[PDB]
Amino acid sequence: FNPYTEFPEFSRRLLKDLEKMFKTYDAGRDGFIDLMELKLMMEKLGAPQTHLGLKSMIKEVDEDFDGKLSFREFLLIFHKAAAGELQEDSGLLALAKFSEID
Ligand SMILES: [Ca+2]
Ligand SMILES: [Ca+2]
Ligand SMILES: [Zn+2]
Ligand SMILES: [Zn+2]
């Protein structure tokens, strides 16, 4: 997976910021942000979500259907937010906008 090819619209500094946020909230360091790590992230960001809200956020970008976010899926959140592709009620929008990222 090349995030430089896949997401050229992202500066290389923005990309390492995103890697940093990703590594922060992947507590277990398995390379994924799972449902509980996402829940904690939305709380620590100040935009807590319902349990089923968190599952629907993951499903929006869970391209391999395993219920957890790999780093390429986590990048896709900000790609979709940046391109205006998120539904207006999506928790991913709140993740992006509460995140300290633009
Ligand atoms: Ca994890
Ligand atoms: Ca996944
Ligand atoms: Zn996977
Ligand atoms: Zn897109």
Numbering used by the authors: 79 to 180
Q: What did the original publication write about this model?
A:
The EF-hand domain-containing protein 1 (EFhd1), a homologous protein of EFhd2, is localized in the mitochondria. Unlike EFhd2 and AIF-1, EFhd1 is localized in the mitochondria and may regulate mitochondrial energy metabolism. Here, we report the crystal structure of the core domain of mouse EFhd1 (CDEFhd1, residues 79–180) in a Ca2+-bound state, comprising a proline-rich (PR) region, two EF-hand motifs, a ligand mimic helix (LM-helix), and a C-terminal linker. In addition, we identified Ca2+-independent α- and β-actin-binding and Ca2+-dependent β-actin-bundling activities of EFhd1, indicating that EFhd1 might be involved in the Ca2+-dependent regulation of mitochondrial morphology via interactions with β-actin.
We determined the crystal structure of the core domain of mouse EFhd1 (CDEFhd1, residues 79–180) at a resolution of 2.07 Å and refined to Rwork = 20.9 (%) and Rfree = 22.9 (%). We initially attempted to crystallize the EFhd1 ΔNTD (residues 69–240) construct, but only the core domain was crystallized due to proteolytic degradation. The CDEFhd1 structure comprised two EF-hand motifs (residues 91–162), an LM-helix (residues 169–176), a C-terminus of the PR region (residues 79–89) at the N-terminus, and a C-terminal linker (residues 177–180). Collectively, EF-hand 1 and EF-hand 2 of CDEFhd1 had a distorted or general geometry for Ca2+ coordination, respectively. Collectively, CDEFhd1 formed a compact and rigid domain structure through these intramolecular interactions. Collectively, the overall structure of CDEFhd1 was similar to that of CDEFhd2 and AIF-1, but the hydrophobic interaction network between the LM-helix and hydrophobic groove of EF-hands in CDEFhd1 was similar to that of CDEFhd2, but not AIF-1. We identified two Zn2+-mediated interactions between one CDEFhd1 (MolA) and other symmetry-mate molecules (MolB and MolC). Zn1 was coordinated by H129 (MolB), K133 (MolB), H157 (MolA), and E163 (MolA), and Zn2 was coordinated by D142 (MolA), D144 (MolA), a water molecule, and E166 (MolC).
